[PDB]
Design a protein around this ligand. Structure first.
Ligand SMILES: CCCCCCCCCCCCCC(=O)SCCNC(=O)CCNC(=O)[C@H](O)C(C)(C)COP(=O)(O)OP(=O)(O)OC[C@H]1O[C@@H](n2cnc3c(N)ncnc32)[C@H](O)[C@@H]1OP(=O)(O)O
Ligand SMILES: Cc1ccnc(C)c1COc1c(Cl)cc(-c2ccnc(N3CCNCC3)c2)cc1Cl
Length: 392
């Protein structure tokens, strides 16, 4: 495929379009703690809810710092709208730069995230106005393509993936209304079903350390290249997205583990997962669901091109991930059908979700890509090799 249109740099407007009366554009400076707070206040009460109004995503301030100030980031791409009189932040749309591979073409893009409109300004056609203004701001900086995911269907998706959920603390997920009691069964039998080992089983598995950066970078890129659509990681991005920094990050967001070969001492696998709570909206017993999401991972056994061998190693690596997540007090472990994940989701007892994530490319045309599912929307080993990028 290829780009849909060429942008004339000389016709990109210097000033933004007009906004609804009483409102004005504002560039957010998220190094300023009050503005980061303002953004957190908007998202906490106005961001992504499920269709039953039971859970709302609760990105923490530390997550946002991490997600929005990654290598190459520009404040010009953190876009707000404020009420002119109260100065209150009522809408947002953000991007960060990265490079992607789309069928062996390498593309400079922005990843678009955190589109949010205060509930009281909904249904006023403000979204197209947000979208068009961040577009202009990117165009001024020499970026002309974007990638994004959404829960809703818009023109020409590149792929689609289903959410899966492996219960770590089943009872709490039972009390919040998330997990069913099905149907001639017992709390105890469900806890039994979900009970995990207390120690990990992969030989040489330890926490990732800064010294592992170069070797993990190399393994990740090799693995990711087995996917038609992937993130082309830099060294700095491996550092930023995978290596938690104790001294500077007060609330930990990223968790990475490597597999040091007991004999050769070369890293042969790694996996990672991040922390993203949901607010439980109307609930007596509980306030908070603590969720871990599967992130990037890689394994040398994938290059043996033996699908049975890969299944074996992933079944073991991922079950250690569950055990480690449980140990860090997470209530549920979430994954999508992207990567080689259909090889293990069901067998490790993830239950199919109702959530769907659709993937989009702006100003770039390419043939559809497999999302790990089939025409019944259930995991399928023949339908992988497509989506290799995970977006927050
Ligand atoms: C090179 C640079 C390119 C840069 C940009 C590339 C493109 C980036 C694209 C943005 C990627 C975002 C990535 C994420 O962050 S996805 C996260 C989206 N956020 C939420 O779901 C949070 C809760 N919801 C809301 O805040 C509002 O409902 C939102 C803001 C979602 C809609 O507000 P509202 O409900 O007040 O609607 P409206 O009256 O203003 O506008 C109606 C129009 O908006 C279109 N719509 C609805 N949902 C989405 C959606 N998720 N992506 C794109 N478009 C969407 C819809 O087709 C309709 O168009 P049409 O019916 O006229 O055809
Ligand atoms: C199990 C659970 C726990 C906490 N919150 C939700 C919504 C759920 C329900 O499953 C969903 C459902 Cl139904 C929907 C989404 C969802 C939908 C639309 N957009 C997203 N985004 C999050 C990723 N970036 C793009 C926007 C997530 C995500 C999940 Cl994890």
């Amino acid at each position: 495929g290829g780009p849909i249109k060429i942008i004339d740099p000389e016709k990109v407007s210097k000033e933004p379009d007009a906004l609804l009366e009483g409102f004005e554009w504002a560039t957010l400076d998220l190094t300023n703690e009050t503005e980061l707070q303002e953004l957190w206040d908007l998202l906490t009460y106005h961001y992504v809810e499920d269709d039953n109004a039971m859970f709302r995503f609760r990105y923490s301030q530390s997550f946002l710092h991490w997600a929005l100030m990654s290598p190459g980031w520009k404040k010009e791409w953190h876009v707000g709208v404020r009420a002119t009189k109260s100065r209150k932040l009522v809408a947002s749309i953000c991007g960060v730069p990265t490079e992607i591979n789309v069928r062996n073409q390498k593309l400079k893009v922005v990843e678009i995230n955190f589109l949010c409109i205060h509930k009281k300004l909904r249904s006023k056609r403000l979204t197209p106005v947000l979208i068009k203004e961040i577009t202009r701001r990117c165009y001024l900086n020499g970026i002309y393509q974007a990638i994004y995911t959404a829960g809703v269907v818009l023109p020409t998706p590149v792929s689609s993936c289903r959410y899966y959920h492996r219960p770590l603390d089943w009872l709490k997920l039972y009390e919040v209304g998330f997990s069913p009691l099905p149907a001639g069964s017992t709390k105890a039998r469900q806890i039994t079903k979900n009970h995990l080992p207390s120690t990990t089983s992969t030989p040489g598995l330890r926490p990732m350390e800064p010294k592992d950066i170069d070797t993990v970078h190399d393994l990740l890129q090799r693995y990711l290249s087995r996917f038609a659509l992937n993130q082309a990681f830099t060294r700095e991005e491996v550092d930023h997205w995978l290596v938690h920094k104790p001294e500077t990050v007060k609330e930990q967001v990223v968790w990475a583990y490597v597999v040091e070969d007991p004999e050769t001492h070369k890293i042969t696998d790694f996996f990672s997962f991040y922390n993203l709570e949901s607010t439980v909206i109307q609930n007596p017993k509980h306030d908070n669901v603590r969720a871990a999401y599967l992130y990037y991972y890689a394994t040398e056994t994938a290059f043996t091109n033996n699908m049975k061998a890969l299944k074996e190693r992933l079944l073991m690596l991922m079950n250690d991930a569950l055990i480690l997540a449980k140990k860090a007090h997470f209530d549920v472990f979430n994954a999508l059908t992207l990567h080689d994940n259909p090889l293990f989701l069901e067998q490790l007892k993830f239950g199919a979700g109702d959530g769907q994530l659709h993937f989009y490319l702006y100003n770039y045309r390419t043939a559809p890509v497999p999302g790990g599912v089939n025409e019944k929307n259930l995991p399928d080993e023949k339908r992988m090799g497509g989506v290799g990028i995970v977006m927050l």
